[PDB]
Amino acid sequence: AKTYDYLFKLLLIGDSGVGKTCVLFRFSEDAFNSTFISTIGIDFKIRTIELDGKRIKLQIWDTAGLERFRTITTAYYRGAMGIMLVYDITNEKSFDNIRNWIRNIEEHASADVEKMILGNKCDVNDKRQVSKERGEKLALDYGIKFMETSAKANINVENAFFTLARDIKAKMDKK
Amino acid sequence: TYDYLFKLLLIGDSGVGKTCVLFRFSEDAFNSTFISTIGIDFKIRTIELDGKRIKLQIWDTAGLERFRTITTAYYRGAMGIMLVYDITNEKSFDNIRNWIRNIEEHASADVEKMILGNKCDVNDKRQVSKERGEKLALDYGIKFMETSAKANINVENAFFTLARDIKAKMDKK
Amino acid sequence: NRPRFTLQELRDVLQERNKLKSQLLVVQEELQ
Amino acid sequence: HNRPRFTLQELRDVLQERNKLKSQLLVVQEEL
Numbered sequence: 001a002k003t004y005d006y007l008f009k010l011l012l013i014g015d016s017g018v019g020k021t022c023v024l025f026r027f028s029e030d031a032f033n034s035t036f037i038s039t040i041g042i043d044f045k046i047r048t049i050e051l052d053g054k055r056i057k058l059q060i061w062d063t064a065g066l067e068r069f070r071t072i073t074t075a076y077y078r079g080a081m082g083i084m085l086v087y088d089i090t091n092e093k094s095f096d097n098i099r100n101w102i103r104n105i106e107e108h109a110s111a112d113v114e115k116m117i118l119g120n121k122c123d124v125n126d127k128r129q130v131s132k133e134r135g136e137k138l139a140l141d142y143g144i145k146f147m148e149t150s151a152k153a154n155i156n157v158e159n160a161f162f163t164l165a166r167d168i169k170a171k172m173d174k175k
Numbered sequence: 176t177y178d179y180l181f182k183l184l185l186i187g188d189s190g191v192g193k194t195c196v197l198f199r200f201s202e203d204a205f206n207s208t209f210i211s212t213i214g215i216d217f218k219i220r221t222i223e224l225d226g227k228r229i230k231l232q233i234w235d236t237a238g239l240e241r242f243r244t245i246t247t248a249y250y251r252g253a254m255g256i257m258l259v260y261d262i263t264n265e266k267s268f269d270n271i272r273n274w275i276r277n278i279e280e281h282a283s284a285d286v287e288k289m290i291l292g293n294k295c296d297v298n299d300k301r302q303v304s305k306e307r308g309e310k311l312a313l314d315y316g317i318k319f320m321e322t323s324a325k326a327n328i329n330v331e332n333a334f335f336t337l338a339r340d341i342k343a344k345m346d347k348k
Numbered sequence: 349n350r351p352r353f354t355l356q357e358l359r360d361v362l363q364e365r366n367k368l369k370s371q372l373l374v375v376q377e378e379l380q
Numbered sequence: 381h382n383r384p385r386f387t388l389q390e391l392r393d394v395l396q397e398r399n400k401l402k403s404q405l406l407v408v409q410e411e412l
């Protein structure tokens with residue numbers, strides 16, 4: 001009856017407009033819509049994957065980046081088992097703000113939560129403002145895994161979610 | 176599957192007991208906690224009349240003014256409307272005339288209407304005698320009942336009577 | 349505390365909520 | 381109107397209800 005062996009709660013955070021909802025739409029529905037519809041508060045989507053012969057249900061919560069929803073969104077940090085911190089490689093402010101999103105994680109998420117930084121929109125390289133090297137170095141400084149992704153071109157979206165789920169599972173299994 | 180779908184609406188001031196009246200009808204339960212309705216909600220109950228299965232889609236409106244635009248949208252499709260006041264709150268009774276005007280501005284001219292004077296178990300705070308509710312309803316040519324969601328008085332009777340009156344009108348096709 | 353969200357913001361969620369309730373009731377009764 | 385009208389608690393309650401219904405719906409949908 002239970003359609004899974006593990007259930008992982010994941011969370012997407014980051015500035016408004018960086019592509020969190022599009023990343024989830026690509027992962028959960030394998031599609032891309034360029035029409036921007038800002039997220040009201042929070043939403044979630046589901047996808048089940050297979051790791052080590054186990055069924056892993058991913059319950060993925062998509063937060064609004066806009067400040068007016070901040071209190072609504074931060075209530076969902078405590079239960080998260082893995083958190084994607086998303087910025088937009090064409091928006092330097094969104095990258096600068098990753099440091100503040102990490103602070104928000106430290107303040108409200110579980111101490112041991114798995115984290116990953118995604119530099120999204122890596123298909124738009126002629127409007128790139130954040131070098132891949134700078135993204136890698138920031139992630140290195142915080143000891144967090146890093147990937148550049150594109151919801152539009154479908155680059156590293158499955159890789160990001162599969163990798164985060166494998167890191168959650170390995171920690172669970174070893175304990 | 177059903178024979179007919181009757182869209183009903185509950186309107187009236189905040190706190191008069193619209194949601195508890197619906198809770199009694201749909202769940203046969205009552206709770207004293209006040210959880211004010213945010214905009215609108217609905218419940219479904221299917222009943223049997225004259226060998227026809229009637230699906231009642233019952234929309235439960237918020238009474239506070241800040242939800243007025245949200246709630247009035249639902250008048251247009253209503254086939255029956257309960258106008259609810261609180262027998263312990265004369266202000267809610269006086270506002271029935273304003274709710275009637277709201278029906279006249281947004282619902283069909285022939286919509287079935289019924290007035291409920293709710294909380295009739297709280298006689299130690301009563302502010303509106305039963306006769307005043309009866310006279311108000313008579314003047315508009317509509318039916319009246321005193322109800323109590325808490326004591327289970329006239330809630331089933333009110334909804335079945337409203338549904339039967341809608342069905343009788345409709346059967347005159 | 350203070351009013352913060354617009355009519356359209358609340359309406360959008362209310363209408364999504366209503367739609368899911370209707371869809372839920374339908375699949376529920378379809379288990380006859 | 382861009383006019384603020386509804387509180388944190390009001391929007392949050394309806395969001396919570398919407399999300400809980402979405403879960404209930406997904407559950408009964410896969411019972412098929």
Ligand SMILES: Nc1nc2c(ncn2[C@@H]2O[C@H](COP(=O)(O)OP(=O)(O)OP(=O)(O)O)[C@@H](O)[C@H]2O)c(=O)[nH]1
Pocket residue numbers: 014015016017018019020021022023033034035036037038039040063064065066120121122123124149150151152153
């Ligand atoms: N070129 C390109 N555009 C993208 C990509 N991902 C998202 N976008 C565009 O960026 C805009 C913002 O995307 P969203 O997913 O809605 O952003 P969000 O982070 O969910 O924003 P909030 O919900 O307001 O926090 C959308 O119009 C997308 O079309 C991408 O990978 N490549």
Ligand SMILES: Nc1nc2c(ncn2[C@@H]2O[C@H](COP(=O)(O)OP(=O)(O)OP(=O)(O)O)[C@@H](O)[C@H]2O)c(=O)[nH]1
Pocket residue numbers: 187188189190191192193194195196206207208209210211212213236237238239293294295296297322323324325326
């Ligand atoms: N004693 C008594 N209390 C009642 C009765 N009906 C409702 N109440 C109480 O009155 C309060 C208001 O009831 P609600 O049904 O939530 O009021 P409402 O009309 O839906 O109010 P809004 O949603 O704000 O428009 C609650 O505390 C109920 O428990 C009743 O028949 N008798």
Ligand SMILES: [Mg+2]
Pocket residue numbers: 020021022037038039062063064
């Ligand atoms: Mg979004």
Ligand SMILES: [Mg+2]
Pocket residue numbers: 193194195210211212235236237
């Ligand atoms: Mg109510």
